[PDB]
From Swiss-Prot:
Cited function: RNA-dependent RNA polymerase that performs primer-template recognition and RNA synthesis during viral replication. Initiates RNA transcription/replication at a flavin adenine dinucleotide (FAD), resulting in a 5'- FAD cap on viral RNAs. In this way, recognition of viral 5' RNA by host pattern recognition receptors can be bypassed, thereby evading activation of antiviral pathways.
Boundaries of the shown chain within the full protein: 2420 to 2987 of 3010
Subunit description: Homooligomer. Interacts with non-structural protein 5A. Interacts with host VAPB. Interacts with host PRK2/PKN2. Interacts with host HNRNPA1 and SEPT6; these interactions facilitate viral replication. Part of the replication complex composed of NS2, NS3, NS4A, NS4B, NS5A and the RNA-directed RNA polymerase.
Domain RdRp catalytic: start-end pairs: 209-327
Cofactor-binding details, from the entry: Binds 2 magnesium ion that constitute a dinuclear catalytic metal center.
Protein known as: RNA-directed RNA polymerase
Originating species: Hepatitis C virus genotype 1b (strain HC-J4)
Membrane disposition: Single-pass type IV membrane protein
Modification comment: The N-terminus is phosphorylated by host PRK2/PKN2.
Catalytic activity: RNA(n) + a ribonucleoside 5'-triphosphate = RNA(n+1) + diphosphate
Residue positions where Phosphoserine is found in the record: 29, 42
Subcellular location: Host cytoplasm; Host endoplasmic reticulum membrane
Cofactor(s) this protein requires: Mg(2+)
Amino acid sequence: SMSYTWTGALITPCAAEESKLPINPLSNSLLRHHNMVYATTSRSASLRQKKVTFDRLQVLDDHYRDVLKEMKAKASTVKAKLLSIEEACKLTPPHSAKSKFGYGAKDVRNLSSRAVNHIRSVWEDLLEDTETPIDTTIMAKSEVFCVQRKPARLIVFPDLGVRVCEKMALYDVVSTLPQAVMGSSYGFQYSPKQRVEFLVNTWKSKKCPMGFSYDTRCFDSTVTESDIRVEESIYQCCDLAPEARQAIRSLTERLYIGGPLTNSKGQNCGYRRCRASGVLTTSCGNTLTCYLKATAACRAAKLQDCTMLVNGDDLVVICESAGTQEDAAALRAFTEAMTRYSAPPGDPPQPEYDLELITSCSSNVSVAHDASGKRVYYLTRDPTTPLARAAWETARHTPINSWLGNIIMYAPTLWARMILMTHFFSILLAQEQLGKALDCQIYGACYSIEPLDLPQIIERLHGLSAFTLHSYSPGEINRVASCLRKLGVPPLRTWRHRARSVRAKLLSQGGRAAICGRYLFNWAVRTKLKLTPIPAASQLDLSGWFVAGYSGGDIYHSLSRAR
Ligand SMILES: O=C(O)c1c(-c2ccc[nH]c2=O)c2c3occc3c(F)cc2n1Cc1cc2c(=O)[nH]cnc2cc1F
């Protein structure tokens, strides 16, 4: 069937859309080539619509059925809890899209009678009605990139009341079931440090390793009605409250498998028969579907001793080499099996015999040295997108601060330490906002974090070595230096000067600011300060940062204020 059908009504914005990076002094201090930075808008939605619309011709076989049964046997161990309306409301981000039913996310979080009454009515409707398709809004996503232009991605999501019901029925399932089914292959259970540990250990555990990333083209569009019902058959293996079993059954047929598309003007836009990007099950469903197809495809291709790592549609496989010619033919057989399963490739996969040459979750393993000179592996990435977005977030107030998430997740990197930390600490200190909580996203869930708490967060996630790394790889230094020239970012000597200046100001303030000066900026001086374990680090409640993926799932993981 067709992934989408369209009526001809346009994908519309619900307000003016900004496409160009503003010419602003603060963003200009970071990046001078402002014309190279753009944001996607609804103006490119028709180009995306064409790419995402195609027929799917899925063929399943014995390997697929065998893997599915193995996955279901593990899912059979799960006991999932139904969330109360109150627990589900508390998981709603404060700036979540309002309902069309007279209330918003703040009303949901406050347990307002209008919000709660409506959510209850939606819940009762899921229990009673097993068929009526649930309306969804389709919007063009606004994302910032550097030129060389990508058309806007399309987001599809149901109303706020439905999103709260999805949490009640499925938040516990999507949080716990992926690891029960996929074990060590489930990517979202790992912090970046644990991910690099798993990749390096897996790589070195093979006699002669071969690894590859597999890029599925337009993964959400490749997801079939069969795949969604297969996904539900795994969820159905959980022990569930009867209303949760009905709600999962109803949500599967009325929302997850497909449904009508409405634009921001309320016009009938089309019909979806593939994965919606903006529902609670997107991450979990995508991961299960990708793991299932890839595990079966590995068997069809006769790949030896596979270890996979999956995060949604992002797949990396590390196996035992059978020889160069054999590996090349076995990868072609894997691709052919994936294509039959409706997971055709974007970039054709290529065997890799150097772990540092593999990109997974847009990241690569690199090496640096700590204060003792010992090798430390860490995850890095090309800094182009992070810097273009950091420039955008400097010029405009954005709901999610990608810069903060990048500092947290890429804390050991040369670029996050020298550029991101220096830039934002300089500006926030000047504005008396170092202690002001900001929203960022970790594995798709929203968190409200104070920049002053970064030292303990980094110590907990990455270890104290994140504050001592030096002698970065020549390849990594070259990539950073090249990006800076491309974007018109000041050279690293300028960043060192700016860091020495903000470090001095931070130290002069005492308190948490002085902890930031000491730990975050020790790289900037010769007269190193002693870095001991931060008392605040061990007390940090990181319960739930690295449990599961929630991208598009409308999840907020920071604490609710007691009413
Ligand atoms: O956004 C993520 O879920 C994320 C981060 C992250 C980075 C920065 C801020 N907050 C974050 O959670 C992250 C991450 O951060 C550092 C290492 C590392 C890593 F290995 C995997 C990581 N993921 C999964 C993830 C990231 C990307 C991606 O970035 N591009 C394309 N496809 C992707 C597919 C994915 F499944």
